Amino acid sequence: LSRIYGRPVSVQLHVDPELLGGLSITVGDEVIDGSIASRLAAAQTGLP
Amino acid sequence: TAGRVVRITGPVVDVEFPRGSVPELFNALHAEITFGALAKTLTLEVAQHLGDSLVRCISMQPTDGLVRGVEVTDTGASISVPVGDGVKGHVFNALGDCLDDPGYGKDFEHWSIHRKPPAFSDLEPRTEMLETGLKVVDLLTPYVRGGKIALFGGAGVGKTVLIQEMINRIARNFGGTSVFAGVGERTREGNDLWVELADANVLKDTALVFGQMDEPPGTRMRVALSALTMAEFFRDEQGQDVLLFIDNIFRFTQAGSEVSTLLGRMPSAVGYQPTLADEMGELQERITSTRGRSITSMQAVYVPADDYTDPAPATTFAHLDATTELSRAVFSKGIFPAVDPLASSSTILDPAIVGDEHYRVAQEVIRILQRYKDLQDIIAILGIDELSEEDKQLVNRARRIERFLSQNMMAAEQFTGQPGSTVPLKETIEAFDKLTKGEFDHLPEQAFFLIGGLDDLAKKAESL
Amino acid sequence: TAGRVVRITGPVVDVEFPRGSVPELFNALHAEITFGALAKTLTLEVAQHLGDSLVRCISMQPTDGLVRGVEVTDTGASISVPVGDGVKGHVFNALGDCLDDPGYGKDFEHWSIHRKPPAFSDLEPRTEMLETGLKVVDLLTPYVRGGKIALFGGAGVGKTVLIQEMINRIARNFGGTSVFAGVGERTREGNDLWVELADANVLKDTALVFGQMDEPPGTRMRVALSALTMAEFFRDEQGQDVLLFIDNIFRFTQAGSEVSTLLGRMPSAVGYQPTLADEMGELQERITSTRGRSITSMQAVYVPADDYTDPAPATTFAHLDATTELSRAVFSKGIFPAVDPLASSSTI
Amino acid sequence: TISAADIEGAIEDYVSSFSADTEREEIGTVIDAGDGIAHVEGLPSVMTQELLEFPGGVLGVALNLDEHSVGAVILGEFEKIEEGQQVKRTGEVLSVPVGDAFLGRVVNPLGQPIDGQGDIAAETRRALELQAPSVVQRQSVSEPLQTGIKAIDAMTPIGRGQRQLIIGDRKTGKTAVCVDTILNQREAWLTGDPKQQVRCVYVAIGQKGTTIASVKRALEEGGAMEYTTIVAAPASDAAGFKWLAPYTGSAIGQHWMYNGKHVLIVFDDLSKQADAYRAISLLLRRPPGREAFPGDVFYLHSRLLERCAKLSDELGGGSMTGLPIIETKANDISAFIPTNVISITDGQCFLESDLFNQGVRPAINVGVSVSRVGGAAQIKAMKEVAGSLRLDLSQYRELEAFAAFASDLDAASKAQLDRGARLVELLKQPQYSPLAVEEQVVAIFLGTQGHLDSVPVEDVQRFESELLEHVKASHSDIFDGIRETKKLSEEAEEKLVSVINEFKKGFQASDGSSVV
Amino acid sequence: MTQELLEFPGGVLGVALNLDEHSVGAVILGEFEKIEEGQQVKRTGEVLSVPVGDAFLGRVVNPLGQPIDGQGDIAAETRRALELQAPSVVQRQSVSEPLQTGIKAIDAMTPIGRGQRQLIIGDRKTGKTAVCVDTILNQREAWLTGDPKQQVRCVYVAIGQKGTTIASVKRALEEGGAMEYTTIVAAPASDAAGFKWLAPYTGSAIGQHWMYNGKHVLIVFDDLSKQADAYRAISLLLRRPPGREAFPGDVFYLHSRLLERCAKLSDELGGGSMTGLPIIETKANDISAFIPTNVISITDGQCFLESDLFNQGVRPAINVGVSVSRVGGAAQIKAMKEVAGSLRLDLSQ
Amino acid sequence: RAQASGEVAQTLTQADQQLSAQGDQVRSGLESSVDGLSAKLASRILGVDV
Amino acid sequence: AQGAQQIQLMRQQLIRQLRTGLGAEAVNKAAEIVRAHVADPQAQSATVDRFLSELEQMAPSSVVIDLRAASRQSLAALVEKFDSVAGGLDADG
């Protein structure tokens, strides 16, 4: 996180059971998320 | 979890909910009202989100006697009404409770009131020559089976009488199921209609649903949707022909305008609510016949102060195919059906599918009436003595024809002692050809008023 | 220095400025569009002071792809037009850029579009007769020097030929040059006029200004002012008498009413702007002749719903001297002027 | 199992090619909704008219900006919108996929195949908003764009690149004229090179689905379905589709026009679009004006109808023609939109209802209709044959107003009255019957020279028809000549005179009398 | 509580119409020049109610129910709330009885039957009051006999009229002798907007109490446009947004809520019945105004009166071309329909 | 043309069971290697071999 | 040829059932595989490692700037004044 953003970054973690794995980070408006459920839904919705 | 009430005004009520508890749009809500003598159960339907966990909605019951701080509960579901074969021969209100028996019909399956219009890929035009026993509709604007039919006109012109006569003439010769819906009308009319239907055996074959005008505007806006739900359920699964009659359409647009005045939206031209056309189009798309299923609908539309420039009638005209309107000038003249042929039109009237004689007769009579309407003012001012021979002959022929379109009906028995009379199509065609040829001009004025058949015309002629 | 946009809606744009760099009324502001497929530069004018260093402007080009936070610079001057003797060789719109090529540049002088009418003392105290080469016009409907003349007619009644006749007659007889300023003119008609004036060998000594429908109302309202400023420069620098041509006046008031209603004012007097007389007088006050030189103009006005008591024609007719009519029956007779002597008159 | 093998291969190829990337973007949240619009906050930088994306699959566009709020319009389904959803900024200004496989199909205004036919191919994406061709890229208009109607091309000619307007009252027959014109070009399509070929497009706004089905059936039976496409926005759709369909139609037509193929745009109705825009603007809380209309409404039309124009030979010489249709009520023209659209275009065709009530079926008014281009868009032969019948008709009606009760007249006055009555009775025509140029010219020449002045006015039309049929059967040289030289020769005139005389010698309707 | 009566220190009474988050709007009924900031407000825990009794006959009371001109007080058995529910469809029954009137034209053309609402419109200086007065006076001969099945009790309601007019009407009734079986509710124009807005509901409740007991009741409204004007003034003063013609949007609804109670009960609940004759004014015989259009649609018949006919020589001055009754000939006696029939067609032709 | 339309309707009422006859064996043979496709999908989704 | 078009439409109905079957099988089998095979805790940490690698290889990004203008200026001035005026504060002062 300090590599991508020059300023130091604090950490606040919230435990979520819905996701089957992965990790998500939110630094404000920008968001990054890698989740099994999200990938499965994205693959399913583009099936045809 | 439950919310509270913070503001109350008119029919609109807004409520507050805790986090993660706001319901989606169009969800029923229940509220409790207590008093020494006024105890009820308020039913509300969600209208819009105001943010900050606040939702504003309307009510289907009078809001008299409510106090702030009363909890409001949610069912998490939409409005529903029981359906099935047992619905036949009963009277229901908007909410679906049976008015005849308080406990009847509380065990059938239930369907949500909100639905989706059928897809465009399954549309097919319907063309059929459906014939009644009335001269004007038979000749000028024939009705279409499985299509839209509607009326027009101001107050006190006689649309309800025509609807009653039409249903009396058709329901006796139908093998399908008919459903009657009353949006706005006096209670006396509904009671008399129920008694008249009970006078025969047809009541067991039809289902009635209606709400009156004294109720709050919430109820007047929802009866049509319930009627459409019942009709759609009957059509979709049974695969049977259905008949649908609507007393009025202006009423629910009026209710929408009233509620949108308070909801907080800006007004528009002639003080009408915005997006009225969208709602009208969304509702009117439900009544449609697919390739394998046919449904025939007859509607009546009211106009304010006989003004066709009003945006609402102009908008609702575009959804019709076969139309017949009424005028007040002909009513003041004396003719009872009071149908104006000049402006009315149909959508199956062409020699491609109809015999050419019909087309020729219609064109000739329309031209004659148009010429008479043109010569009106000169005849009134300078008098008949100023015109030439051709103009005088056309004036006499126009008078004869205009008198001849009148006809007595059975529904006039209560008002006049004359009994009913019905005439087929071919006889009317031949009679109109004879009249437009000009071989009946020797008869007096009164011989052509209130005449059913040609033999009746001859008998009246011998009576003077 | 730099300022940031705050809110965007329609063509109306709000900007914010630091404490010590607030622009005054009727300035010019520039901005850019980053998107590659819609690369463009935008010009804006200042019309109101909302307070707290917030300015509400109007854009002369359609707004699309604009992003919040984009910097806005300041020109420091009003809308400028190029003036010089290199004018009247080509065609160009209010912004001044030549449509046929961008070859012309900032070489000429630049004059502000906004000016003031002449003072009261130096006004001419006497009228003057104006003579032309047409027998019927001179005999029946005399033309007042420095006046305003209205013409009513359609297509196929010999109007364009009359305009060309007058242009060549003024160019050759008394010298000088005349300008044409089409407001709200359709593109194909403008191209046809350009080609025809090219063919008639009278394109050399006329300056053409165009106003297109596709543009927002700002250009449609400023084009006439720009053309009048150009004619004024010609008159006051060369000493040559000039003639001004205006296609329509109804569209001018239409654009005025539109720009009035977009700024969120209050309509009055049959859906019109409340100050139409002020703009009409400000436009018409810069036509009178002074200092021995004349600026004669011709207009064509459109009456709505065949009503002569409508506010716009009523205000327009207050500054009129001569009226001319054309019809088809006289053309069916087969004569050139095609002017009805029974429907035309003058105040002199 | 060959089809099964293909299905399995396609499924395997798609599934083995799955790939995705982890990239950052800005996401905002909805704060309120209802009545077809919703408010979204949290998006730092979004271009105006951006195509947003919603978690449920519904779409939206951004119209109104603010310091801390962004307005939006929901296009498709609306009930899934609720507080708590997350929006995702995607892509850029919306566009339309245009190509050449759109022919003979019906598509969603957004570019989806609502028809029962399978999916369509795509060629290239074009953004809706683009600048119109400049003033230095146009030519003059000179081309005989036929219409198949005698009255229209006799009175008010139409050429390529010319915008013509049709304004009518309720139940008059505008759509019939439009359909006749749209299907008149079968013979033109049948020719080999695309110099005569025209690719036509149809747009339908705010109409019942059954009417669209009937129109499609009529066109299919006519056989012109092969070279046309339909865009449909029925009443069941939200306001967004009704607002946005004409831009899609114009862009699709413009792509064809830009590459050197002639096209023909037709807009079914423009009042509905104005009403939808008014509803959206009022719902977005913008200042109102006269007749509850926003100020910019006029500008709207100027942006849309001005796209079509003739091109120069430098860019390929394409063309585009528009036929907007306007509906007026109570025979009133002083209304806002009618005045604006009249002042923005050139050429009008008024459709009175009194004329349609009796007599003339086309029911086109003559004393008010006008065409700006005029003779520059005419054929030399029919221009010669025209003989300026406008003045004849005008003085005919003026005199017949007087002569209704007058029996003693000047002989020349009686002759003029009879000629005018004969021409008026000739000018009528039934529906679904287009006519080619040569028979129109022949009929007009028959009318003008006074050959039929001896025919009783009650039964002229039938007689005329018979003559035409006979002329088509036993004669073919005159048609070849008029097709090859586009001019009427004196010898052909003499031969036609002989044919007319010999045919009229042997025709009777009721106590007739063949005369010199 | 919504629409709950509230007490005030000076003795006046108020009604809370709309309830905001932190404030309550109220309208004052009586004298309101003795109201200042800092007073005390108390709740009575009861919804707007009016006393009812049989001693009201032959007296005059204010809309609240306190006598103003009469001597003494009223013994009222019960008090009932103004807002109630109209009878449903299942509890109703058809109409067959006739209501005789002295005017031959009215019964000849458009008969009036019990349980049927009839509407009277016309311009000023036409003579519409005389019809109602004549009907009330004509009821005396029927009232002479004591049978409960042939007795009619009538109620007069006046809104926005000069007191001297009410006195003259009272004098006419006294001379006619009908004052034994009639009552008057007076709301003179000098009063505030509350009484003008509230009087008709009080009259309707007073009539409804007797209607439930099985006695036939007649109701006559003098003016109805004045009530609409008063409601418009109240709504505009209460900062409610306006609508078409500056009228509040829901005005039509109000009229419906007043004109639906009048009906005829079924045999199970008794032979009670109600009739009404509301009167609507107009200017220059103009129907384009939306108030007449709204009020016609909920009536069973109307009579048009034109000044030109009045000056022509026709004293009743009714226009047979437009006047019509929806009930028809079922109301009139059989002998009348045998002798008289289809006369309106003859007159129109 | 009506008789030809009737013949076309007969052809349609033959094809409406022809495709069902084909689809019976299609459905019979669909799940032959469906497990392999699902395994490939899962391996691609997880980013590692299954 | 229209009947051939409906033959292609019937093939499209086969495509419809193909899509339905493929969707059902993909949903069921993939969901069961992901929720059964790799549901062991010892796998979870491994997944995190993979994600870290992605966060290691992503390109750098620029981040700046983390209510009224006059209020903001006044607040900045007050903050500066506090900073200049809090030099001598004690533990309890």
Ligand SMILES: Nc1ncnc2c1ncn2[C@@H]1O[C@H](COP(=O)(O)OP(=O)(O)OP(=O)(O)O)[C@@H](O)[C@H]1O
């Ligand atoms: N054909 C007819 N036979 C007998 N009476 C008729 C006829 N047409 C109209 N009337 C008379 O005209 C009036 C019409 O009554 P009605 O209430 O049905 O009117 P309407 O215009 O259809 O309005 P609404 O929807 O309020 O019922 C009645 O007085 C009725 O007697």
Ligand SMILES: Nc1ncnc2c1ncn2[C@@H]1O[C@H](COP(=O)(O)OP(=O)(O)OP(=O)(O)O)[C@@H](O)[C@H]1O
């Ligand atoms: N030349 C003609 N001869 C005979 N009938 C005609 C002719 N042209 C049109 N009609 C008839 O006139 C009517 C016009 O219908 P059309 O579909 O054109 O509607 P429209 O008048 O354009 O109105 P709208 O679009 O509002 O429905 C139809 O009944 C059509 O058959």
Ligand SMILES: Nc1ncnc2c1ncn2[C@@H]1O[C@H](COP(=O)(O)OP(=O)(O)OP(=O)(O)O)[C@@H](O)[C@H]1O
């Ligand atoms: N049949 C009649 N014959 C003669 N005069 C009559 C007749 N009917 C009414 N009038 C007279 O016409 C006038 C109408 O008086 P009235 O008070 O009834 O007026 P109105 O039109 O009802 O007006 P308002 O109640 O608004 O004052 C009186 O002078 C009355 O005597």
Ligand SMILES: Nc1ncnc2c1ncn2[C@@H]1O[C@H](COP(=O)(O)OP(=O)(O)O)[C@@H](O)[C@H]1O
């Ligand atoms: N007096 C005239 N003599 C001969 N031809 C004329 C005359 N006036 C006009 N015309 C012809 O009419 C056409 C239209 O001219 P004009 O009316 O000036 O343009 P527009 O029709 O665009 O107004 C021209 O091409 C010209 O040839």
Ligand SMILES: [Mg+2]
């Ligand atoms: Mg009725």
Ligand SMILES: [Mg+2]
């Ligand atoms: Mg049409």
Ligand SMILES: [Mg+2]
């Ligand atoms: Mg009076």
